[PDB]
Ligand binder design. Structure first.
Ligand SMILES: [Mg+2]
Ligand SMILES: [Mg+2]
Ligand SMILES: [Mg+2]
Ligand SMILES: [Mg+2]
Ligand SMILES: [Mg+2]
Ligand SMILES: [Mg+2]
Ligand SMILES: [Mg+2]
Ligand SMILES: [Mg+2]
Lengths: 386, 386, 386, 386
C-alpha cells in the first residue's frame, strides 16, 4: 500500500528531519539529531539517500581531526544502510559573517572566504559520491534599494560560479551545479528570485553546460507562480538537474510543509509532468516537520512525503492511461499543439490564403476548447472517483 | 516646474488615454477617442510619441481601402505635431478567436492566422518608423493543468518568434523584438510570466540578438518581485529594449495606475537605475486613467505620469550627487562590491591563507553594513528633506 | 454516482452560467442566455434553484410593461420546473452612474438613486419567495487615498443598511440581508474587504439581527486568508446566512472557477465544516465557466460544481466516521479543546497551584501534538487511499 | 529639523531595538541589550516611553527575588530619564510549551498556565503605569485543517478574555485590552487574522467596552489590505486603543522595517488620518533594525522611525491646509460624502421622484470625479514639489 523502496529515489536533507523547530518567534522544541541516527531511520522508512550542508555534517569551527571523525562515522552509516549521497550544498547563510551574503557580500574578503568554504565542501561531496552540488543564495539580496547595486552583484555572482566551474574542470570532477531560487526570506528580496531568472543567468556563465536549476515547490509559489509550468520550462531548456519537493499555502513565509500538503492539485500536475517527461534524478524533500511534533511526528511527516508522491503517481498514471481521457485530450486539440505551426516554412505561410485572406475567424472562434470536461476528468482521477 | 519636452522621450499607447473604462464588472464611462485627437493632445502635453496595436489604429475587419485612409489620417497628425512612433505591437487577445492564445493556441490554424496578422503589422510599423516591436502574449497560458502541455507550447512559441526573425531579416528591416511578460490575467497563468522567464527563453531562439524584453512595473509587482532588481538583470544581459512605466498596489489585478502611484519608493529606485545606467530608449507609459475620470481627468493623469518621472529624476540625481551620500556608499562598501572577488585567479585564491585558514570571521561579522543610515539619506532626498 | 437532486439545495446565479465571457482584454465568446432556458437547463442537471440581480432578469431601462412580461415568463419557468429563488441581489456596479459606488458614492443624488433601485428589487425578491437579500458593494472603495474619507463612507453605508432594515420591517417582510465581502476588484480597495470587517460593521447597525454575511471562497483567498477559518467565525457569531462556492488559485484577479478547482484541500475542509455544523442554507455557486468553453462546456462546468461538493461530502463523512481518525483526534487533544479552560472560575484558577507555581512546563512542552499523523489520515481519506 | 520630543508620544518596545538578529536561517548578529541601556538611549533620541513583554524585562524562570531586582533597576532608569511605560504585553509564543498556542492550546493545562502568566504581568503593568495591555496571539492557529476546531477555539479565546476582564474589574484596575491581529507567521494561519476579525470578536465578549485593537502596519499588508482603511474602520467603531507603526514590502514574511519604509504612500495617508482624527494614544514602533546593522545602525534606524513620522505629519498638514486642495476636495464632492443620504427619512425618499422616476442617470454618470488631479496634488505635497 504505497510503500517506498530505494528504487523510487526518495532523498532527504539532514536539515529536514533534523530541524529543531526554532522559528523567528520561538525556541527549539526538539533535540538535535545525530546525522547517523537520521541515516538509519530514513533507510528504515524506504529512503534512497540523504543530502547535506557542510555545516550539518561537520560543526562549524571543527579541526581537521574532528572533521575526519565526523566523516568516518557518517560513511560507516551509509555503508551499513546502503544509503547514497546524491547531492550536497554549502551553508553560506547561518554564520553572522554572511549577513550581507556570501558570493555577493559587499565586503570583498567575505566573498573570498565564501568561495574557499564552498570549494572545501565540493571536494568532500565528490568523495561521498554526490553528482549534483546545489547553491542556495539565501543571503544574496537586500532590504533597501541603495545597499546593493544589482549589476555589480550579478558580476560578482557570475565571477563566483565561473571560478567554481574552473575548479571542478581543473580537478576532473564529474559533478554539476544547480542553483536553487527563492524570491525572498531571509533577505527582503533575493537575487535570482525565480526559476526563470536563474535559467537566464546560467546562459551568461563561461561554461553553461555545467549549471542547471534546483527549483523548490514552495519557493515559486511564494511568488504566486505555477510550479509545474516553471518545471516544464526548466525541462524544455534541459536544465532540471535536481528538484526540491514540499508544500506551501500561498504567498507567505516559506512553510516547507510535507509534500502533498499545500496546493494539492499543483502536486498532482507536477508528478504527472515529472513522470511523463522521464525525470530520473532524485525526488528530494526539502521540508520541515512542524514544530508542534515530537520525534514520532517527524518520521510520520517524512513517511507522508513519500506516500503522497506514490499516491499521486498512481492517479496521474491512471489519468493518462484512461481511454476517455485520451479522447478528451484530442477533443481539446492537445495533439494539434504538438504539431508544428509552419513546417512548410515562411514563404509557404505567406502564400497560404487559408491562413489569413480566406480564414474563417468566426467559425474558429465558435469552437469550444472542452477544457472543463477534461479538467473534471482529471479531478475525478485525483479523488479516486474513476 | 517639472515640464516635459519631447527630448525627455515620453511616449504613450493609443490604448492608454483611449481606454473607455470597460472593466469586468462595468460598462464604458468615456466615449472612444479618435487616434488623431489623442496624438494632438499628447503633443500639447509635451509627449515625444505614441505607440499602437494594429487594432487600435485600424478597426478589425477593415478593407484595404479603409486601412489606407486610417493610416493617412494618422500620418498627417504625426507630421502636424512632430510626434514619433517608436514602438508598435499586435492585438492577439481581444477577438474571440484568440481565446486560447495566438502563437500557442491549441488549434494550428489559429496559430498560423496569428503569425500572418503579426507580419502584416510589422510591415506597417516599419513604414511608420518604429524601432521596437513588442509582443505581449496575454492569452498564452491556461486555467487548468491538462489544457496546455507547456513544453509543446514553448516549442510553438519558439517556432513563432523564429519565423518572425526570419521574416525581418529576409526583408532587411531594422527592427527588434521585445517580449512583455505578465504572470497572470486574463489567463489563470500566462507563459513566460516574469522578466527572468522571458530572458531565459530568448537564449533558445535561433537569432537571440534580435530579441529583448519590455518589462512593465505593475506586472513584476503582480508576482511580488522587485522591479528595479529585474530591470538591473535585464540591463546586465543587454536586453532592455523598451520599458512600460506605471503603478500597481501589490499583488492583485493589473491596475495600470499612472506612474508614481503604487509603490513610490520602487519608482524612485527605478528612475535612479535607468538614469545611472544611461538607458536611452523611450519612457513609455502603459497606464489606464481610472474609469472615475472624465476627459479632463484623462489628460491630468497622463500629465502626472511625466511629472512624477521628472520629480523622481531630480531627487535621484540629488541623492547621487550629495557628498554625504557618496561617503555613506563607501561606508557601506558599495565600492568594494564593484571590485573583482579574485582577479588574482583561482590558484592564488586557493593559496591565499588570508581567505580561509587565517581569516578572522568574528571580526568581519562584527562590521555593521550601515545600510539604515544610507537608506534614511535616500528617504530624506526623496521627500525633499535634504 | 454523485448525482445531485434538488434536496441537496444547490443553486446558481443567472449571471454564472449566463456569463458571456467578456473580460478586461477580450470580447464575449458566447451568446447571451435567456433566463428561461437557464432555469430549464439547471433543473435538468439537478439544481434546486436560481438567484438573480435585478438587471439579470429585467434589462436596465425597461418600462413597467416590459418588466411585468419578463417576470411572468420567469415565473412560468419556475412553475414548470419546480425551481426556487432563495436569494436575490441588486446590480449597483455595471451602469456608469455607479462608477464611484452606490451606497457610498460621493454624489448624494447617486446614493439616493442606489437606495431606490435596491428597494424596488426587494419587493420583487419577496414576491418570488427569496429569503435572503445579498449586497455586494463592488464599487464602494477607492483607487487613491484622498478620494474617499472612509469614516464618512462607513456612516453612509450604515445609513443605507439602516434604511433598508426600516423598510423591510415596516412592510412586514420575512427577508434578511447578507453582505458579501471582497477585498479588491473592480476598485483598488473595497470597503468591508473581508468576512471579519463585515461582521464587525453589522454590530453597529440599528437592527443587527437582520444582517449576516455571504462569504465567497475566492474572495477571502484573494487576501490570502483561510476560508474555512473565516466561515467558522461566521458560524460562531450566528451570521452565516448564505454562502458563495467557487475556486480561486491564490492571490490574483477574481477567477470564479468552478467549485473544487483552485485550493482543493480548502474545499474539503469547508465541506467538512458546513456538514458538521449543520448549515442548512443554499449551496450557491458564484462561478464563471471559462471563456474558452462553448455551451456544452458551460453545463459541464456547472455539473462539476455539484459533483465536487458531493464527492468531498462523502470523503469528509468517511474521515469523521473512521474509528482510526476518532482515535487520532483524541491523540491530538481535540476533545480537550472543547472543554472549558476554567469552569471552576477566576478565584479557583488563581488559587490553583497546579496552574502555575507547580506546573511542569518542560513535561507539557515535550508532548507532541500528533498533528501530522492526523493530517495524513485526512489526506488519505480525501484521495480515497483509505 | 524634524527633531522629536517626548510630547510627540513616540514609544518603542524593548524587543525592537533589542532584537539580536536571529532569523529562521541565521544566528544573532548583535549582543543582547540591557533594558536599562535601551531606556537611556531611547530617551536621548527623544522617545516618550517604552513597552515590554514580561519575558523581555524578567528572564523566564526568575525567582521572585531576581524578579524584584530586575523591576527595581528598570524603575530607576525610568525615574532617571522621565520615560513612561504606556503599554505592556505577555510573551505567550517563545517557550516550547506554547507551541500550539496559549489561550487556545488544545491542552487544557497549558491554557490555564497561559492565563496565570498573563494575570501576573497585568499586575506589574498596572504598577508601572501602563494604560493598555496588548495581546498578540501569535501561536493561536494551525498548519493543518483537522488540528484546530475553530469554533471551539473561539470559545476558548472568548473564555480567556472574559476572565481577564473579570480580573481587572474585580481588582479595580484602570487598564484596557488591545488585540493585535496578524494573518500568519509563525502559525500557518493565525486566529483573528485582521483588524476586522478582531473587531467582530470583541463584540461577543461580556464587557466589550474593555477591549479594542492594536493594529500593525505590516500585518494588514501581509494580507494585501489597505492599512489606512482598516484604521478608519477601527476609529469609526471607537476601538483604536493603540497602534504599531512600521514598514512592510507587500505580501511576504513579517519584515518589521522602520516606519516610512515599505509602502511610503500608505504611511502618508495613515499619518494624515491619525492627525485629522485626533488620535492621542502612543505612536508605538514595533520594528526590527535589520540584522546587517551594528549598534550605531540600531539607533539610526530607531531615529528614522520618528523622523519619518514627523516629515509625513508636516506634508499631510500642508496638504490639508492648501486652499487648492480644499477646492479640489469640493470638486471631488468629499463635502457631499459627509452629508446624510436621506435625513428626510424613508417615506420622503420613497416619495421623492427626483431620486428615481425623474433622476437623470446619464447626466450623473457623465460627471468626472476629478480624483486624479486631487491625487497628484497629494503626490506633489508628499514630494515637496508644492
Ligand atoms: Mg523552502
Ligand atoms: Mg530547498
Ligand atoms: Mg499592466
Ligand atoms: Mg504593458
Ligand atoms: Mg468572485
Ligand atoms: Mg459572489
Ligand atoms: Mg510585525
Ligand atoms: Mg506588533
Amino acid at each position: 500500500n504505497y510503500q517506498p523502496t530505494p528504487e523510487d529515489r526518495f532523498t532527504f536533507g539532514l536539515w529536514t528531519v533534523g530541524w529543531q523547530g526554532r522559528d523567528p518567534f520561538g525556541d527549539a522544541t526538539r533535540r538535535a539529531l545525530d546525522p547517523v541516527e537520521s541515516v538509519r531511520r530514513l533507510a528504515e522508512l524506504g529512503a534512497h539517500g540523504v543530502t547535506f550542508h557542510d555545516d550539518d555534517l561537520i560543526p562549524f569551527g571543527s579541526s581537521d581531526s574532528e572533521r575526519e571523525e565526523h566523516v568516518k562515522r557518517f560513511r560507516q552509516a551509509l555503508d551499513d544502510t546502503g544509503m547514497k549521497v546524491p547531492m550536497a550544498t554549502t551553508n553560506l547563510f547561518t554564520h553572522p559573517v554572511f549577513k550581507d551574503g556570501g558570493f555577493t557580500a559587499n565586503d570583498r574578503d567575505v566573498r573570498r572566504y565564501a568561495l574557499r568554504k564552498t570549494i572545501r565542501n565540493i571536494d568532500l561531496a565528490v568523495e561521498l559520491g554526490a553528482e549534483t552540488y546545489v547553491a542556495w543564495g539565501g543571503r544574496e539580496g537586500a532590504e533597501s534599494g541603495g545597499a546593493k547595486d544589482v549589476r555589480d552583484a550579478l558580476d560578482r555572482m557570475k565571477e563566483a560560479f565561473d571560478l567554481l566551474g574552473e575548479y571542478v574542470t581543473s580537478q576532473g570532477y564529474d559533478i554539476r551545479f544547480a542553483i536553487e531560487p527563492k524570491p525572498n526570506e531571509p533577505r527582503g528580496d533575493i537575487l535570482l528570485p525565480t526559476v526563470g531568472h536563474a535559467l537566464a543567468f546560467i546562459e551568461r556563465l563561461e561554461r553553461p553546460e555545467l549549471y542547471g536549476v534546483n527549483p523548490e515547490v514552495g519557493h515559486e509559489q511564494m511568488a504566486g507562480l505555477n510550479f509545474p509550468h516553471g518545471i516544464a520550462q526548466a525541462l524544455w531548456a534541459g536544465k532540471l538537474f535536481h528538484i526540491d519537493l514540499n508544500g506551501q499555502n500561498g504567498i507567505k513565509y516559506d512553510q516547507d510543509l510535507r509534500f502533498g500538503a499545500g496546493d494539492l492539485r499543483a502536486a498532482f500536475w507536477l508528478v504527472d509532468l515529472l513522470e511523463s517527461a522521464g525525470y530520473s534524478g532524485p525526488r528530494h524533500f526539502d521540508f520541515k516537520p512542524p514544530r508542534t511534533e515530537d520525534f514520532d511526528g517527524v518520521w510520520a511527516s517524512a513517511a507522508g512525503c513519500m506516500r503522497n508522491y506514490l499516491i499521486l503517481k498512481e492517479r496521474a498514471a491512471a489519468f493518462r492511461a484512461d481511454p476517455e481521457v485520451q479522447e478528451a485530450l484530442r477533443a481539446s486539440r492537445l495533439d494539434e499543439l504538438a504539431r508544428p505551426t509552419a513546417a512548410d516554412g515562411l514563404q509557404a505561410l505567406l502564400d497560404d490564403r487559408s491562413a489569413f485572406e480566406e480564414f474563417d475567424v468566426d467559425a474558429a472562434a465558435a469552437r469550444g476548447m472542452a477544457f472543463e470536461r477534461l479538467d473534471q476528468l482529471a479531478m475525478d482521477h485525483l479523488l479516486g472517483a474513476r
